[PDB]
């Protein structure tokens, strides 16, 4: 069964690819090869960026696919069928979209989570580590489900910090506390 | 790569700045692929001796309005920029 | 750092920009795209997310190359205000369109602002005399009020207002704002000249009027935010200068109409008769930022260009909600030759009351309404049969009403040019007397032709002598 | 000549998918050989991907999506001549008077400026 539905469109494509290759039990290989073909698509810069946008036939599109699978042997067989589908649907524009989505599904299979501790300033490494530790200590990180912690700088939340991951947040920024303080003193 | 070379081979190799090639067409309005350079409300000339005014500049496509009969235009004709906003001789 | 973007789309005058950096846009911000035609001002109106705004563009969008550099100027368009607004006619951005050079300003204020609070409201009803008999008699205006006109297609919608400007605003000492949304340019130049001539605009001196003028030529989007610009100028007088203001708006149908144009393009499924689904909110915002508060009493005058001459259309309907007086003027009464063309059974004011204009005025009005309502009622019978076939008692009422109908036409001073008939400004005190007499049938004994297009009751008497010759 | 396989028959609006890069122009006349006889479809749009949208001039009953279409190459070409005088001709420009195959000089496109 799906590793929890991602989007409705394009991630239905990813979901299908995923569940089909999950039952083939060859997801890491598929993902890696998809990364590799994605890399050689990107590293074909003219007409591997500028022929992601349709402008040519079904038959000509198919021959672009054929050149792509000529570029490296092996690409699973499920992602070789995925290329067929995309050629038939004449949409390579959402190819890297599917790649990213398949990546999300893949790293969901890994259980590798991504988080963020948004601040309005670059944060200490001690804070990064202590929070990563804290998050692992808590059941917020599943354990078997990994974590990345990304500080981003956003002046938006003036000072403070907000820890974010999953659908669980704790927001102890200064801007938000000020918002409530101001508001309560607007009474 | 040899693959990349073959990709150049199977491509028409127009970068479609200042020219487009028409996609699906009919109903006296056309949707063109390319025309990367294109002023708004410009006059474009289609390769079929009929000219149209770009109305909708949309990501990836531009929607010309055909000043002329449908019979003239067919899909995949080459649209060249007149390069000027719709002007008419005055004097 | 510069919130640069490219123009992803130019679908009509609803350009969409795609901001590169993840520095956020904000709704109702203003953006400047620099063009070799000078800058173009756009206003962020939707966020489509993933750093793609969709922006209303005030001025024309011709020429734009898809992928045009943007810079975000931040926040809504900022007008320039001061005493220097007075005696200047200004573009939406605020640049003098009368080309009277740089408008020195103290405060530049955002076009958008919040409606003042329920607490700040203050209500009053100081009877303003217009010197127009029909207005005074049927539905007198009052200070701080929101006055309403529902004039038909080119019924001299402007002309009615011009007479009012000529009378009331030269009898007002405080500040006054003229805002003309999408009005015919030539008439606006005439107005500008007339104001300068009548010294209300004195360019050498100071002007007790300021003006914002929006040509009917101007692109729809500009016309949409012409109102908000004017509304700010009014707020500056109301608030910052404190002085009692006045405001004239013509046509607020253009405000609605413009909105209906942009909405579809904006991405909205439109409501009946094509009207914007945001009609109620937009009208609401405009009309609650015009109000008499502790800060200042702003008497406002709003003109509705009834579309297709149907007043049940949603745009007129929502106007009726936000007014304290209305004086619907209709094409039929105009066709009958009665200038002014105010419908006498379709005028109302909350300012007509026996505790306001006194029991005697209210009593006088009661009889006027009754006579006219009867007269309208017998229109069927009058047509199907003869007027002699009317019941004798009723025939007296009909004859009185026929006289009343003719009596109500009073020559106007701005119309005096056009009609050729010298204008008549009749005192409110005089008006009550004049109609009272007619109700007592005193001067009902002389022709309908005598009553037609003349001033006070005394003038009718003199005109009877004239007619007799 | 260009040939294509029927790829829709929603109502009497029949979409035909034609060979790569080779697609009839707008207002051309197409003939689909049918068990009925022939069906004349007129190209009134290009829907992209070498597909058209056509209208029918005859009933579309019993079509199988895939049937071969043949492109005449332009607006229906109807016989003209003094021969055609006193002959009832149906929409596809063929005798329904049953006074036999109308001897023709010239045939001419139906859309004419």
Curated annotation (Swiss-Prot), chain A:
What SUPFAM superfamilies does this protein map onto? N-terminal domain of the delta subunit of the F1F0-ATP synthase
Q: Keywords assigned by UniProt?
A: ATP synthesis, Hydrogen ion transport, Ion transport, Membrane, Mitochondrion, Mitochondrion inner membrane, Transit peptide, Transport
| Keyword Cell division set for record | no
GO cellular component terms attached to this protein's record = mitochondrial inner membrane; mitochondrion; proton-transporting ATP synthase complex
Q: Which domain of life is it from?
A: Eukaryota
Q: What is its main location?
A: mitochondrion
Q: Which GO terms describe its biological process?
A: proton motive force-driven ATP synthesis; proton motive force-driven mitochondrial ATP synthesis
Signal sequence span per UniProt? Answer: none
Function, please?
Mitochondrial membrane ATP synthase (F(1)F(0) ATP synthase or Complex V) produces ATP from ADP in the presence of a proton gradient across the membrane which is generated by electron transport complexes of the respiratory chain. F-type ATPases consist of two structural domains, F(1) - containing the extramembraneous catalytic core and F(0) - containing the membrane proton channel, linked together by a central stalk and a peripheral stalk. During catalysis, ATP synthesis in the catalytic domain of F(1) is coupled via a rotary mechanism of the central stalk subunits to proton translocation.
Q: Which PANTHER family match?
A: ATP SYNTHASE DELTA CHAIN
Q: What does the similarity note say?
A: Belongs to the ATPase delta chain family.
Protein name, entry field: ATP synthase subunit 5, mitochondrial
Organism lineage reads as: Eukaryota, Fungi, Dikarya, Ascomycota, Saccharomycotina
UniProtKB/Swiss-Prot annotation, chain B:
**What extra comment accompanies this record?**
Present with 41500 molecules/cell in log phase SD medium.
Q: What is this protein called?
A: ATP synthase subunit alpha, mitochondrial
Subunit details for this protein?
F-type ATPases have 2 components, CF(1) - the catalytic core - and CF(0) - the membrane proton channel. CF(1) has five subunits: alpha(3), beta(3), gamma(1), delta(1), epsilon(1). CF(0) has three main subunits: a, b and c.
Q: What does this protein do?
A: Mitochondrial membrane ATP synthase (F(1)F(0) ATP synthase or Complex V) produces ATP from ADP in the presence of a proton gradient across the membrane which is generated by electron transport complexes of the respiratory chain. F-type ATPases consist of two structural domains, F(1) - containing the extramembraneous catalytic core, and F(0) - containing the membrane proton channel, linked together by a central stalk and a peripheral stalk. During catalysis, ATP synthesis in the catalytic domain of F(1) is coupled via a rotary mechanism of the central stalk subunits to proton translocation.
Instruction: Kindly list the residue ranges recorded as spanning the membrane.
Output: none
Where's it found, cell-wise? Mitochondrion inner membrane
Q: Which family does it belong to?
A: Belongs to the ATPase alpha/beta chains family.
- Which positions carry Phosphoserine? 11
Swiss-Prot record, chain C:
Keywords assigned:
ATP synthesis, ATP-binding, CF(1), Hydrogen ion transport, Ion transport, Membrane, Mitochondrion, Mitochondrion inner membrane, Nucleotide-binding, Phosphoprotein, Transit peptide, Translocase, Transport
Catalytic activity field: ATP + H2O + 4 H(+)(in) = ADP + phosphate + 5 H(+)(out)
Phosphoserine modification sites are 334
Annotated GO molecular function terms are: ATP binding; ATP hydrolysis activity; proton-transporting ATP synthase activity, rotational mechanism; proton-transporting ATPase activity, rotational mechanism
EC category name: translocase
Alphabetized InterPro entries for the sequence = AAA+_ATPase, ATP-synt_VA_C, ATP_synth_F1_bsu, ATPase_a/bsu_AS, ATPase_alpha/beta_chains, ATPase_F1/V1/A1_a/bsu_N, ATPase_F1/V1/A1_a/bsu_N_sf, ATPase_F1/V1/A1_a/bsu_nucl-bd
Phosphothreonine sites (modified residues): 73, 198
List the GO terms this entry assigns under cellular component, sorted alphabetically. cytosol; mitochondrial inner membrane; mitochondrial intermembrane space; mitochondrion; proton-transporting ATP synthase complex
Which Pfam families does the entry mention?
A: ATP-synt_ab, ATP-synt_ab_N, ATP-synt_VA_C
- Swiss-Prot/TrEMBL GO biological process terms: proton motive force-driven ATP synthesis; proton motive force-driven mitochondrial ATP synthesis
UniProt cross-references to SUPFAM superfamilies, sorted A to Z: C-terminal domain of alpha and beta subunits of F1 ATP synthase (SSF47917), N-terminal domain of alpha and beta subunits of F1 ATP synthase (SSF50615), P-loop containing nucleoside triphosphate hydrolases (SSF52540)
Q: What is its EC number?
A: 7.1.2.2
The residues the record assigns to binding ATP are 151-158
Subcellular localization(s) per the UniProt record: Mitochondrion; Mitochondrion inner membrane
Miscellaneous notes? Present with 164000 molecules/cell in log phase SD medium.
> HAMAP family from the entry?
ATP_synth_beta_bact
Curated annotation (Swiss-Prot), chain D:
Q: Which residues carry this modification: Phosphothreonine?
A: 72
Q: Where in the cell is it found?
A: Mitochondrion; Mitochondrion inner membrane
Top-level taxon in the UniProt lineage = Eukaryota
Spell out the note in the miscellaneous section: Present with 164000 molecules/cell in log phase SD medium.
Assembly: F-type ATPases have 2 components, CF(1) - the catalytic core - and CF(0) - the membrane proton channel. CF(1) has five subunits: alpha(3), beta(3), gamma(1), delta(1), epsilon(1). CF(0) has three main subunits: a, b and c.
Function, as annotated, reads:
Mitochondrial membrane ATP synthase (F(1)F(0) ATP synthase or Complex V) produces ATP from ADP in the presence of a proton gradient across the membrane which is generated by electron transport complexes of the respiratory chain. F-type ATPases consist of two structural domains, F(1) - containing the extramembraneous catalytic core, and F(0) - containing the membrane proton channel, linked together by a central stalk and a peripheral stalk. During catalysis, ATP synthesis in the catalytic domain of F(1) is coupled via a rotary mechanism of the central stalk subunits to proton translocation.
**Similarity remark:** Belongs to the ATPase alpha/beta chains family.
Its recorded name reads ATP synthase subunit beta, mitochondrial
What organism is listed for this UniProt entry?
Saccharomyces cerevisiae (strain ATCC 204508 / S288c) (Baker's yeast)
